[PDB]
Every structure is written in structure tokens, then in C-alpha cells.
Amino acid sequence: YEDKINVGGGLSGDHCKKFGGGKTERARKAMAVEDIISRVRGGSSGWSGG
Amino acid sequence: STPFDNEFYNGLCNRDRDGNTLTYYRRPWNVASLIYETKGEKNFRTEHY
């Protein structure tokens, strides 16, 4: 504003903020159990085992 | 090996009529008895982590 005497004024304001977050988790598991048993009382010296 | 004699026999022959084919063996008097039970087996197993 200026009248009989001059007066000067000036102001400025600016602010900026940016936040960020990122997370990712991955997991994988697997289990398999296979057992085979064979008992033969056949009566041959070789063929029973064969 | 054998630490003793296994061929000696005491008296009347003891028959050993058993086996795959038709053949007659002898059992020594030192051995009480021998059988021809031919058992057989095998196993298998798997696992994963």
C-alpha cells in the first residue's frame, strides 16, 4: 500500500513433502515322503529275492 | 573260516531233503540242523525338503 509515505511488503510460502513405503514378502515350502518295503518269503534261493 | 572240523559225522546219515533241485545233501553231526528257508526282502524310501 502507498499513500502519503510509501510502505512495501512481501511474503511467500511453499512447502512440499513426499513419503514412500514398499514391502513384499514371499515364501514357499514343499515336503514329500515316499517309502517302499517288500518282504517275500517265497522259498527260492535266487528267485525269491529276484 | 571254520575254527573246527565240520566234516565228521557220528552215526546213521541224517537226510537233508530240501532245496531247489532234486538233490540230497548231508548234515554233519557238529551242526545241529540247517534249514534252507530262503527269505528275501528289499526296501525303498525317498523324502524331500
UniProtKB/Swiss-Prot annotation, chain A:
It comes from Homo sapiens. It is found in: Secreted; Target cell membrane. It comes from the Eukaryota. The chain crosses the membrane at residues 7-12. This is Complement component C8 alpha chain. The chain holds residues 384 to 433 of 584 of the full protein. Heterotrimer of 3 chains: alpha (C8A), beta (C8B) and gamma (C8G); the alpha and gamma chains are disulfide bonded. Component of the membrane attack complex (MAC), composed of complement C5b, C6, C7, C8A, C8B, C8G and multiple copies of the pore-forming subunit C9. Component of the membrane attack complex (MAC), a multiprotein complex activated by the complement cascade, which inserts into a target cell membrane and forms a pore, leading to target cell membrane rupture and cell lysis. The MAC is initiated by proteolytic cleavage of C5 into complement C5b in response to the classical, alternative, lectin and GZMK complement pathways. The complement pathways consist in a cascade of proteins that leads to phagocytosis and breakdown of pathogens and signaling that strengthens the adaptive immune system. Belongs to the complement C6/C7/C8/C9 family. It is linked to Complement component 8 deficiency, 1: A rare defect of the complement classical pathway associated with susceptibility to severe recurrent infections, predominantly by Neisseria gonorrhoeae or Neisseria meningitidis.
Swiss-Prot record, chain B:
The gene is C9. It comes from Homo sapiens. This is Complement component C9a. The chain holds residues 169 to 217 of 559 of the full protein.
